[PDB]
From a paper:
The findings presented in this manuscript highlight mechanistic and structural insights for D. melanogaster AgmNAT, an enzyme that catalyzes the formation of N-acetylagmatine from acetyl-CoA and agmatine. AgmNAT is a member of the GCN5-related N-acetyltransferase family (GNAT)2 and, in addition to the formation of N-acetylagmatine, this enzyme also catalyzes the production of N-acylpolyamines from the corresponding acyl-CoA and polyamine. As observed for arcaine, arginine methyl ester produced uncompetitive and competitive inhibition plots for acetyl-CoA and agmatine. These data demonstrate that AgmNAT catalyzes the formation of N-acetylagmatine through an ordered sequential mechanism: acetyl-CoA binding first followed by agmatine to generate the AgmNAT•acetyl-CoA•agmatine complex prior to catalysis. After the ternary complex formation, Glu-34 functions as the general base to deprotonate the positively charged amine moiety of agmatine, most likely involving a “proton wire” of ordered water molecules, followed by nucleophilic attack of the carbonyl of the acetyl-CoA thioester to generate a zwitterionic tetrahedral intermediate.
The AgmNAT (CG15766) crystal structure was determined at 2.3Å, with two monomers in the asymmetric unit of the P21 space group. The two monomers are nearly identical with an RMSD value of 0.262 Å when aligning 862 backbone atoms. Similar to the arylalkylamine N-acetyltransferase model, the new structure is primarily composed of six α-helices and seven anti-parallel α-strands. The active site is well defined in the 2Fo-Fc electron density map and is located near the crystal packing interface for both monomers. Moreover, a conserved glutamate, Glu-34, that serves as the catalytic base for other D. melanogaster N-acyltransferase enzymes, is located within an accessible pocket that can accommodate the acyl-CoA and amine substrate, similar to that observed for AANATA. Although only a number of water molecules (36 in total) were sufficiently ordered to be modeled in the current structure, the majority of them are in the active sites of the two monomers. The closest ordered water molecules to Glu-34 is ~ 3.7 Å from the Oε1, positioned slightly too far for a hydrogen bond; however, we anticipate that the conformational changes upon substrate binding could promote hydrogen bond interactions between ordered water molecules and the functional groups in AgmNAT and substrate. In addition, unlike Glu-33, which is exposed to the bulk solvent, Glu-34 is relatively sheltered and placed close to the hydrophobic core of the protein and next to residues such as Leu-36. In the current AgmNAT structure, Pro-35 is stacked on top of the imidazole ring of His-206 side chain.
Residue numbers in the entry: 7 to 216
Write the structure that this text describes.
Amino acid sequence: DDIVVRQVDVGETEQLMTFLLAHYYPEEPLTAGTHPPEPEAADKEFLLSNVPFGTCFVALHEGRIVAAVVAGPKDSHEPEHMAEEARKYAGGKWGSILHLLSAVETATDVCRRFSVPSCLHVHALGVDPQLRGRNLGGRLMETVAQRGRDLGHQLVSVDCTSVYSARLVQRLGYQLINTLRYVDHLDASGQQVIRPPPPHESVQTFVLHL
């Protein structure tokens, strides 16, 4: 009962972004696997654009941000939205990232695949490792799931990109529905789009029925 979980507000995002640049971006494989090794602005701005939905949360320890989750609702039009954004942004850092993410959205296409009108998709989960024992990640994921039930959303999805994230969602009972290996993902030229360092090998999308 030592940790405060609250919804991020449109007003208070600078600190959220400050946290993410500290405890999410650096280790993130899509970000590390593209060679301008610093997140572009369109990237950060797409993360923050989810806030107005009231679907982003932080965990506060003594009023400092200790963990954050970024999530937003999506529908059957996401594959088109993603394909369009990927065309818009080729071929810069964010374009490469979208290229892969669009391929995933296109392949998973969860609204149509599970006959559901909308999914709550988790875009980013970041945790300050200096607080082991606090179950920060689980609490926030449990929080987006509940927020999703309030909203009447019937699904949550998450494209797991590390081991931590996969184990976390596996133990909250998500089901694995797609696996895309970075080495298997080439561009129109046949060139590998995302090349993250060891030990990252694949994007694994998980879903939870609410």
